Design a protein around this ligand. Structure first.
Ligand SMILES: [Zn+2]
Ligand SMILES: [Zn+2]
Lengths: 151, 152
């Protein structure tokens, strides 16, 4: 690997979890973990600018966006670098997930935050005033700082 | 400035606080904090390798030491990059401190941990087998993940 990181998440309600990052190759970052306490269904998952938790998830800034792109889904060419699309919580409120990203690098996101949202990310497709800005996924439920790890 | 960071400390006991970093110039990093819940007296303060809290303060690794130096005080040229010496808690258990460090950089610290110790850092001077390794300051009381904060 070329770097490992871990985000330990929590928030003002029931939502908590642990998500790990591993830069498998220079091209591919593995992001995998488990978040629970969720309502069943799709929840937006994004990396945000900052990891400042002094105002809980409010001091984390916006989706990480170094290239000045619009909001999109993880497969889209026009996406914020922090845009990881949705994860699904099952009927027990548990989201166990695994994705690889080609844009996000561990070395870029160290000390930033990983945040899960109240609702579904529309992936910029929703035709809503927020679609190309946030994905219209409602409140931030839980956040964790992306911290360096031995792995 | 050339970057900002923040760490929120907690541990198993009463120790907690907030510490902020700002890289003022290429030479100088401002570190300013308040930590409460301490026993009165001197406590070691260090940046450690990792910000991984999955085993609480035990997964943070050792003092950050990219240059393979010996442990020292913050004004020494033989020190770990992460060596910030002692902070003093007053009679009420509060340590308010402000340092300007010439070696530690804000880009060093982010994603790592800031840890405050049970006892006094001997600054490498104590003649003990741990002096040049840790400063012999006992247990870890509290640790905070050092996060990026807004630079403007
Ligand atoms: Zn976005
Ligand atoms: Zn040291």
């Amino acid at each position: 690997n070329l770097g490992a990181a871990v985000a330990i998440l929590g928030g003002p309600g029931t939502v908590q979890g642990v998500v790990r990052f591993l830069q498998l190759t220079p091209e591919r970052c593995l992001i995998e973990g488990t978040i629970d306490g969720l309502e069943p269904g799709l929840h937006g998952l994004h990396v945000h600018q900052y990891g400042d938790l002094t105002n809980n998830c409010n001091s984390c800034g916006n989706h990480f966006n170094p290239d000045g792109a619009s909001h999109g889904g993880p497969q889209d060419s026009d996406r914020h670098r922090g845009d990881l699309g949705n994860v699904r919580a099952d009927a027990d409120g548990r989201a166990i997930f695994r994705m690889e990203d080609e844009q996000l690098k561990v070395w870029d996101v160290i000390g930033r935050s990983l945040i899960i949202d109240e609702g579904e990310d529309d992936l910029g497709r929703g035709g809503h005033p927020l679609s190309k800005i946030t994905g219209n996924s409602g409140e931030r439920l839980a956040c964790g700082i992306i911290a360096r790890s031995a792995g």
